[model samples]
Target: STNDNIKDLLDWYSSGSDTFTNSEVLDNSLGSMRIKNTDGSISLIIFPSPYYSPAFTKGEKVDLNTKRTKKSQHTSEGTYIHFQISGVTNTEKLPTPIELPLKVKVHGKDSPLKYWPKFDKKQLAISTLDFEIRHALTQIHGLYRSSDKTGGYWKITMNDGSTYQSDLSKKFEYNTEKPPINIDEIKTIEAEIN
Candidate 1:
């Protein structure tokens, strides 16, 4: 039954064009990333992209930027261009680290554990923790976008005092397709994908 469900879900998620959406676009760029240990828990990070910048406005007429309205057949709410990214596993909780190779769109109905492709308990237990380094970047950018403020890029300092800086926008680009799964109607897509 799980296998059947998984196959069905995958079919729907991958059914449409393999094009990228804001979420999917962000997902693909973080391929095979490293899941670093942060504090007492593991943290996932994803870099920012030029497409969903705070400077961008609807119909702002920027180069390579287009406005598209996203709608879902299952819901009555409307959708706008928002950047979302997801991580997958056999189930919501992970036992070991397994890298997820595919990316999916995010909307209102999304949960971190829901979009993961199907896998058995064992598979789920052994599933890799595919890294999405851009999540933090996106979060930071999202803050800037919402607050109409600006912030510095991602930088890290090692124990030895060596520091590294990351350019969030330049590191990633936008997706070609923005799925209709707005923040509110994301559950259907997550169900289909998981």
Candidate 2:
């Protein structure tokens, strides 16, 4: 009868998996554990070794005295916890992306006609202007100037149809010139023809 009882106890201990189990606790004794509550909130629990307990809620110190035991010296060194929280509905309230209007402008020297470039000038070939605008945009992206000459100026029309001017002084004023146009507000570039 005693042998059978011992055998039954061994079988119960070996196959008692249905009772309760925590995979994270079995993998690492020193880490964070999270529990979801019925009230649409979460509870975070941290487990640190007794030797190196940290400060907890409301400035409470968690110091477990394990130094008196021989096994305390072999406690794991890496154990920490952190958490963040937000409403579950916050993800659904995100704003959709916006589509900005396209606009362009060009710059040149003053001539006898005092002509300023327009976006739809019939005599002007858009291909050439497109090249110049692309080149200028590239230079702006690289935080450098494309042209070395300071005789002329270029005006950039933003996506909102608002214009920003880069004159002779503004062109060379690299240090003082804050980026007049926000890169994000630019949709297209065109030559301002007379």
Candidate 3:
């Protein structure tokens, strides 16, 4: 029944054309069928079982021209799909690290008491810290802590494996009366990437 189902889907896929277009492939497993379209789109067909009819959906589009190669394999365990991106061949020159400035802010536990501190600056590699740079504030938030001795610690790492860290404990002046609040600033970080 499984073999027949695969053949039927393949026949339907190649019904009109003598051959497949755009080098498409169909991979089916268990109760689902995945069709890699010619134009780099993926479609899915779901079957509850061999006796029942199936449901299908248009696959999402994907970029196939990147530095990666896509592979699909079907086995008894399941249908395995993988994307392999080649490693960088040229590592002669490391890209320059760009500067990022963040403003610190302090907020009360459940109130609107916010304090803005002087901007702090740091340099980071564009490639290694792209996500960190894009979500710098959130990354900084990961380092936040509420305590008497230490407020928090922030660390920035570069593509070349270099890292820089700063202490936020002294950056904030806290009051022991109220519950400890968040003392960090939100600021815009800008950099030029070639």
Taking the tens digit of each residue's C-alpha lDDT, what string does model 1 give over 95-176?
Answer: 5443322232223222343223332122110001111223322332231232222223333333355433333223222232
Compared with the true structure, the alpha-carbon lDDT of candidate 1 equals: 0.24
Q: Which segments of candidate 3 are over 4 A away from where they belong? A: 1-89, 95-129, 142-194
TM-score result, candidate 1: 0.20
For each predicted model, how many residue pairs clash, with residues at least 3 apart or on different chains? Answer: 19, 4, 7
Among all windows of 10 consecutive residues in model 3, the one with the lowest summed lDDT is 174-183
Q: Residue-wise lDDT of candidate 2 within 1-194, one digit each (tens)?
A: 22443343233222211101111111212334343323323234333323222222332212110111111111154332223111010011113343223232234422222222222111111122322333343233211222322223345565788764443222222223221123345544333321
Ranking by lDDT: 3, 2, 1
Better lDDT candidate (1, 3)? 3
Poorest stretch of ten by lDDT in candidate 2? 85-94
Superposed model 2: Cα runs more than 4 Å off:
1-150, 168-171, 179-181, 187-194
Q: Look at candidate 2 and tell me the lDDT of residue 74.
A: 19
Higher TM-score: candidate 1 or 3? 1
Query: Which digits, one per residue and each the tens of the lDDT, describe model 3 over residues 1-194?
Result: 22443343223222221112232335545555455645444434333323322222333222111111234444566644433221111112224432345333334122132222221222111222222322332234322222221233344443454444433332211111111111121133222211
